Amino acid sequence: PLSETKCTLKSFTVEKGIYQTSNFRVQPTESIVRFPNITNLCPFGEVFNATRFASVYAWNRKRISNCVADYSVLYNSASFSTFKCYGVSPTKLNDLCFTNVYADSFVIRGDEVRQIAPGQTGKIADYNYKLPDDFTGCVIAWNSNNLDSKVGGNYNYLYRLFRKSNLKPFERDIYFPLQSYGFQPTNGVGYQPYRVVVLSFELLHAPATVCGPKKSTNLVKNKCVNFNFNGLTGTGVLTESNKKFLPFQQFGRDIADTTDAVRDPQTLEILDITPCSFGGVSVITPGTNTSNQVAVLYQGVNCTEVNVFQTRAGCLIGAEHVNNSYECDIPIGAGICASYQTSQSIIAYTMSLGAENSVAYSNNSIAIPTNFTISVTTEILPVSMTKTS
Amino acid sequence: VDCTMYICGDSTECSNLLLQYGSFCTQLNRALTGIAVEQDKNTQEVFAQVKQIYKTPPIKDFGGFNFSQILPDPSKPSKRSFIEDLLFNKVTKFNGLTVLPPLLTDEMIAQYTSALLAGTITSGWTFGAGAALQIPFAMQMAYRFNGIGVTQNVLYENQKLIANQFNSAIGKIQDSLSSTASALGKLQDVVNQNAQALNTLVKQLSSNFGAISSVLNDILSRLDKVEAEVQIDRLITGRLQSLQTYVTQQLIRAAEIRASANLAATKMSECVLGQSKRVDFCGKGYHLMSFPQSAPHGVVFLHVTYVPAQEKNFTTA
Amino acid sequence: SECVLGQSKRVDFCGKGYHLMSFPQSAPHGVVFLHVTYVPAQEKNFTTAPAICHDGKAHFPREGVFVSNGTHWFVTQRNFYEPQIITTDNTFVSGNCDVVIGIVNNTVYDPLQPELDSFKEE
Amino acid sequence: VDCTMYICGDSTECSNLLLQYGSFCTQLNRALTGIAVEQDKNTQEVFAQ
Numbered sequence: 001p002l003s004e005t006k007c008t009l010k011s012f013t014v015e016k017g018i019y020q021t022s023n024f025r026v027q028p029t030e031s032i033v034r035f036p037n038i039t040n041l042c043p044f045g046e047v048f049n050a051t052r053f054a055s056v057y058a059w060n061r062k063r064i065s066n067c068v069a070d071y072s073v074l075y076n077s078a079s080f081s082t083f084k085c086y087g088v089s090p091t092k093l094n095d096l097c098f099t100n101v102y103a104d105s106f107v108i109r110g111d112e113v114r115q116i117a118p119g120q121t122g123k124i125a126d127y128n129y130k131l132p133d134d135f136t137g138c139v140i141a142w143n144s145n146n147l148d149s150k151v152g153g154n155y156n157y158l159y160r161l162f163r164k165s166n167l168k169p170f171e172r173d174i175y176f177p178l179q180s181y182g183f184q185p186t187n188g189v190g191y192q193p194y195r196v197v198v199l200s201f202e203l204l205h206a207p208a209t210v211c212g213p214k215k216s217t218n219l220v221k222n223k224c225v226n227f228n229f230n231g232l233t234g235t236g237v238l239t240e241s242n243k244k245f246l247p248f249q250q251f252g253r254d255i256a257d258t259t260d261a262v263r264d265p266q267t268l269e270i271l272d273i274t275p276c277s278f279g280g281v282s283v284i285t286p287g288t289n290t291s292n293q294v295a296v297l298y299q300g301v302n303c304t305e306v307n308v309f310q311t312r313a314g315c316l317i318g319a320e321h322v323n324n325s326y327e328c329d330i331p332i333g334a335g336i337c338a339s340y341q342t343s344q345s346i347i348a349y350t351m352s353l354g355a356e357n358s359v360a361y362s363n364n365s366i367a368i369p370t371n372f373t374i375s376v377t378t379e380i381l382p383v384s385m386t387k388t389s
Numbered sequence: 390v391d392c393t394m395y396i397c398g399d400s401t402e403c404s405n406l407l408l409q410y411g412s413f414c415t416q417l418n419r420a421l422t423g424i425a426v427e428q429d430k431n432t433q434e435v436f437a438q439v440k441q442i443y444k445t446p447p448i449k450d451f452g453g454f455n456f457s458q459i460l461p462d463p464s465k466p467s468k469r470s471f472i473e474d475l476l477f478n479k480v481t482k483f484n485g486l487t488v489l490p491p492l493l494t495d496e497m498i499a500q501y502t503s504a505l506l507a508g509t510i511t512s513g514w515t516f517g518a519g520a521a522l523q524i525p526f527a528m529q530m531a532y533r534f535n536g537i538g539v540t541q542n543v544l545y546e547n548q549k550l551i552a553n554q555f556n557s558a559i560g561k562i563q564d565s566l567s568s569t570a571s572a573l574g575k576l577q578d579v580v581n582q583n584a585q586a587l588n589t590l591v592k593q594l595s596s597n598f599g600a601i602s603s604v605l606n607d608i609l610s611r612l613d614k615v616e617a618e619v620q621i622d623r624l625i626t627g628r629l630q631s632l633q634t635y636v637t638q639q640l641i642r643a644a645e646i647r648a649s650a651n652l653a654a655t656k657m658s659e660c661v662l663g664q665s666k667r668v669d670f671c672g673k674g675y676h677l678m679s680f681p682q683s684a685p686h687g688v689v690f691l692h693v694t695y696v697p698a699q700e701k702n703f704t705t706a
Numbered sequence: 707s708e709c710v711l712g713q714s715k716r717v718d719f720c721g722k723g724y725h726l727m728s729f730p731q732s733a734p735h736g737v738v739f740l741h742v743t744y745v746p747a748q749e750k751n752f753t754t755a756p757a758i759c760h761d762g763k764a765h766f767p768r769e770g771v772f773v774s775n776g777t778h779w780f781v782t783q784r785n786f787y788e789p790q791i792i793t794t795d796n797t798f799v800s801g802n803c804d805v806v807i808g809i810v811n812n813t814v815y816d817p818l819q820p821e822l823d824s825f826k827e828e
Numbered sequence: 829v830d831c832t833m834y835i836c837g838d839s840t841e842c843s844n845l846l847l848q849y850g851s852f853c854t855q856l857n858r859a860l861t862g863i864a865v866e867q868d869k870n871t872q873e874v875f876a877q
């Protein structure tokens with residue numbers, strides 16, 4: 001502790017006093033991972049490999065739920081020109097756990113995937129299909145040269161070149177505004193067709209039913225752990241709930257806007273979340289020109305979690321209690337003061353307020369001085385400080 | 390408050406990105422620590438105006454004056470008086486919030502006040518100056534009336550009347566406190582001002598600050614380094630701003646409280662340990678004495694005053 | 707202003723004790739006051755009275771208090787023991803002595819009676 | 829001072845993006861209101877003796 005103080009103060013000399021130096025925090029002991037588990041796998045291969053696709057004019061929205069995702073095999077395989085995700089990182093999707101997933105399937109020309117980004121304006125973005133500026137999800141695009149490109153053109157896919165109005169994001173609208181593109185593999189790369197699909201997730205705000213191939217780990221109570229409930233990681237100690245929980249909710253949330261109470265993603269029991277103990281740490285010490293012996297005060301945390309002495313300040317270690325009362329030399333809190341007196345050690349005690357005394361009294365007795373004394377008191381005050389500019 | 394706690398839950402990433410701001414948030418902890426020491430010093434200066442503890446005698450003959458409503462009952466586990474008990478009943482985490490308790494608990498404050506009060510009753514103002522010198526209360530009352538331009542015979546002839554008026558007035562205080570809690574507003578507004586500041590500070594954790602989410606741990610669970618650092622940084626500049634706002638508010642509020650405390654120490658010194666010739670400093674009327682009473686996060690002075698009434702119109706020269 | 711350029715009647719404002727004076731001293735970024743104080747010490751325990759009945763008339767002191775060390779009564783000032791023979795110029799009268807409480811009996815020396823008695827002796 | 833006025837002229841976009849800072853600028857109005865009451869109390873204490 002003394003070295004921590006010396007490091008904190010940026011000196012090799014520590015004076016008589018109490019100095020705050022650090023913080024103590026109970027660490028996790030292990031990790032516990034929990035997730036809902038479905039016996040179905042999410043049919044993503046069915047959409048990317050479908051033999052006939054949706055035009056951008058009439059684009060397909062397939063919906064996904066009640067399944068275990070496996071994006072890692074879809075990531076880890078290489079068939080895709082670009083794999084970009086917004087508000088989310090593509091490696092991380094296997095960790096989170098969602099309520100819905102929508103696969104938005106269609107095909108598009110190459111120079112127009114410059115334009116498909118969310119909030120980016122342009123013809124296809126505003127007239128055909130829109131992504132909101134607060135969009136979260138992944139966009140995949142892969143080149144099509146033997147799938148939607150074929151010799152003799154390919155006019156099964158239509159694009160709306162004009163429109164009298166713009167879209168609310170995630171809407172489909174049913175000179176003539178609709179036109180077609182020719183897709184031969186003879187044309188340059190900018191003119192080839194590109195199969196593009198958008199995976200718009202809605203984050204957990206409700207019971208999640210879609211997430212990666214992980215396995216749960218059995219829960220524990222009354223030991224600080226690193227939890228993960230439906231993708232929300234975190235640390236604390238879990239315990240059974242005295243609360244009465246409602247049968248549509250999952251998360252009880254605080255004024256601090258952090259989780260306090262959860263329900264198990266695959267059990268119906270309700271668990272109260274308490275962060276495992278912490279507290280500020282301060283050092284009680286006298287000056288270094290007398291001794292190097294020290295004591296420690298673990299504020300706001302008692303002695304069942306860290307000579308020992310329990311105070312209403314916290315757990316005090318390195319000092320010995322004494323049932324005599326000596327006037328204060330170091331303040332601590334809650335009426336306790338410390339000192340370094342004689343071998344020699346730090347001691348703690350309840351401060352005295354001066355000596356117990358009483359004035360004799362009656363209705364016919366008085367005291368008058370016979371002598372006196374002239375004292376001289378010193379009284380120092382500051383008047384100014386250094387004029388800095 | 391611990392800055393690292395308030396901003397970063399436990400996350401090492403957030404802590405590393407807070408380190409690179411350097412040593413702002415040591416300054417904030419430093420200022421709060423200064424406040425914490427300073428609030429103990431204020432209480433010390435007010436209540437430790439006495440050199441030694443005095444305990445009241447078990448004699449309750451004072452010329453008819455009654456002080457059992459302000460002296461402690463020995464029967465209580467926490468030795469306090471009736472008026473003190475009315476006072477202490479009419480005054481109503483894991484973000485770094487460590488509520489340091491005071492050095493002086495309410496019992497100790499009561500000890501100090503009882504000592505001052507007993508010294509006032511038994512020793513006049515003499516224990517303010519030097520060693521305590523005993524004296525009867527009636528003669529002390531005479532002393533104090535001589536101080537205001539009234540001869541002491543006026544007391545010694547009207548002693549019972551004066552004692553009855555005093556006892557009745559003390560009963561009036563006891564009544565007004567035993568019903569209404571509006572009178573404690575001076576302390577109560579302070580308590581509210583602090584508990585409100587904490588709540589607004591904590592509620593700032595619910596705001597996004599230009600991020601994808603107001604909760605850090607969601608961000609850590611959904612992004613890689615180069616963009617998670619950005620969103621976190623948006624949170625940092627703004628949680629830190631909230632903390633610094635709180636610090637500044639508390640500092641100014643503490644300076645106000647200091648002014649109040651120095652005033653209270655001045656009153657204790659100049660109206661309990663003596664008689665104020667300063668008109669309408671300690672009570673309205675000509676001042677005689679005072680009595681202190683403990684209060685949570687404060688003090689209560691009971692000024693006793695001489696108020697002329699029932700006059701006539703004479704022709705003078 | 708209130709303790710160098712005068713005497714503070716404010717108790718325990720400028721020094722502990724009864725204030726007399728002060729002296730200032732310069733200090734870097736500050737000032738130093740040296741209060742000089744009168745501090746009573748070395749007292750005794752006397753038995754007192756509020757007042758005296760002489761002939762029926764109550765007597766009270768103009769200044770000081772009535773004290774008794776034993777088989778004798780005195781008047782003296784209040785922050786210093788300097789016992790004085792009681793006289794009618796140390797005291798004053800108001801009313802009868804049935805209205806006072808805690809009173810005692812004692813004869814008050816009068817400084818006029820001896821001169822007058824001396825003339826009757828002549 | 830009204831924070832929303834001073835920052836945003838009347839614009840709903842600016843106001844929405846100020847909301848997402850939460851409740852800073854209630855604190856500022858709160859402090860100014862405290863000052864405003866306090867300046868009346870000072871005058872009252874001086875002159876209503």
Ligand SMILES: *[C@@H]1O[C@H](CO)[C@@H](O[C@@H]2O[C@H](CO)[C@@H](O)[C@H](O)[C@H]2NC(C)=O)[C@H](O)[C@H]1NC(C)=O
Nearest residue numbers: 448449450451453454455456457458471556560
């Ligand atoms: C001082 O005042 C208190 C006022 O309460 C007196 O205490 C009351 O005394 C009567 C009988 O003397 C009891 O019936 C009441 O219950 C007491 N009240 C309380 C609240 O204790 C006390 O007697 C007075 N002192 C003297 C010497 O008369």
Ligand SMILES: *[C@@H]1O[C@H](CO)[C@@H](O[C@@H]2O[C@H](CO)[C@@H](O)[C@H](O)[C@H]2NC(C)=O)[C@H](O)[C@H]1NC(C)=O
Nearest residue numbers: 547549550551552553554555556557558698699
């Ligand atoms: C001075 O005023 C006091 C009251 O403030 C009077 O004292 C009251 O006198 C009546 C006599 O009729 C008693 O019944 C009351 O109990 C007294 N009051 C108290 C609190 O004891 C006093 O009489 C007045 N003096 C004169 C000369 O009239």
Ligand SMILES: *[C@@H]1O[C@H](CO)[C@@H](O[C@@H]2O[C@H](CO)[C@@H](O)[C@H](O)[C@H]2NC(C)=O)[C@H](O)[C@H]1NC(C)=O
Nearest residue numbers: 752773774775776777778779780788789790791
């Ligand atoms: C109280 O003080 C008086 C005055 O000094 C004392 O009376 C004197 O005592 C001395 C002896 O100590 C005699 O020589 C004087 O003649 C006495 N003077 C008078 C006027 O009587 C008295 O003894 C003191 N009482 C006590 C108990 O010491």
Ligand SMILES: *[C@@H]1O[C@H](CO)[C@@H](O[C@@H]2O[C@H](CO)[C@@H](O)[C@H](O)[C@H]2NC(C)=O)[C@H](O)[C@H]1NC(C)=O
Nearest residue numbers: 758759760761762803804807808809810811812
């Ligand atoms: C002071 O002296 C007077 C007389 O000089 C005392 O009055 C006497 O008191 C007793 C007891 O009440 C009576 O028996 C006498 O008749 C009273 N005499 C007169 C002339 O009234 C008085 O008691 C003395 N004072 C004290 C406090 O003892």
Ligand SMILES: *[C@@H]1O[C@H](CO)[C@@H](O)[C@H](O)[C@H]1NC(C)=O
Nearest residue numbers: 036037038039040265266267
């Ligand atoms: C997942 O385990 C839970 C046990 O609580 C059960 O409700 C659910 O049917 C299981 N799913 C499987 C075996 O895929």
Ligand SMILES: *[C@@H]1O[C@H](CO)[C@@H](O)[C@H](O)[C@H]1NC(C)=O
Nearest residue numbers: 044045046048049073074079
């Ligand atoms: C179809 O996609 C699935 C996974 O989505 C993959 O197993 C399969 O190899 C794909 N088909 C082709 C032709 O690559």
Ligand SMILES: *[C@@H]1O[C@H](CO)[C@@H](O)[C@H](O)[C@H]1NC(C)=O
Nearest residue numbers: 013014287288289290291292
């Ligand atoms: C302070 O330090 C020096 C070196 O330890 C030593 O000579 C001196 O005596 C010390 N002071 C006291 C009071 O011992």
Ligand SMILES: *[C@@H]1O[C@H](CO)[C@@H](O)[C@H](O)[C@H]1NC(C)=O
Nearest residue numbers: 301302303304305310311312
């Ligand atoms: C810690 O909590 C309380 C708080 O003071 C203390 O009394 C107790 O000894 C400690 N906990 C347990 C389980 O003993």
Ligand SMILES: *[C@@H]1O[C@H](CO)[C@@H](O)[C@H](O)[C@H]1NC(C)=O
Nearest residue numbers: 320321322323324325349350
């Ligand atoms: C401490 O107080 C306890 C009472 O429980 C007693 O055992 C002990 O002897 C006291 N200390 C001293 C120095 O007497």
Ligand SMILES: *[C@@H]1O[C@H](CO)[C@@H](O)[C@H](O)[C@H]1NC(C)=O
Nearest residue numbers: 698699700701702703704705
């Ligand atoms: C008598 O004194 C009273 C005090 O209120 C007042 O009403 C009256 O005016 C005085 N006498 C005269 C002549 O004014």
Ligand SMILES: *[C@@H]1O[C@H](CO)[C@@H](O)[C@H](O)[C@H]1NC(C)=O
Nearest residue numbers: 360361365367749750751752
């Ligand atoms: C004598 O005065 C001293 C002052 O300390 C005190 O010890 C003593 O109690 C006094 N006399 C009586 C009868 O109490």
Ligand SMILES: *[C@@H]1O[C@H](CO)[C@@H](O)[C@H](O)[C@H]1NC(C)=O
Nearest residue numbers: 362363364450755807808809
């Ligand atoms: C003081 O009161 C008591 C009552 O116990 C009495 O004996 C004593 O004579 C009184 N003294 C005076 C001076 O009134």
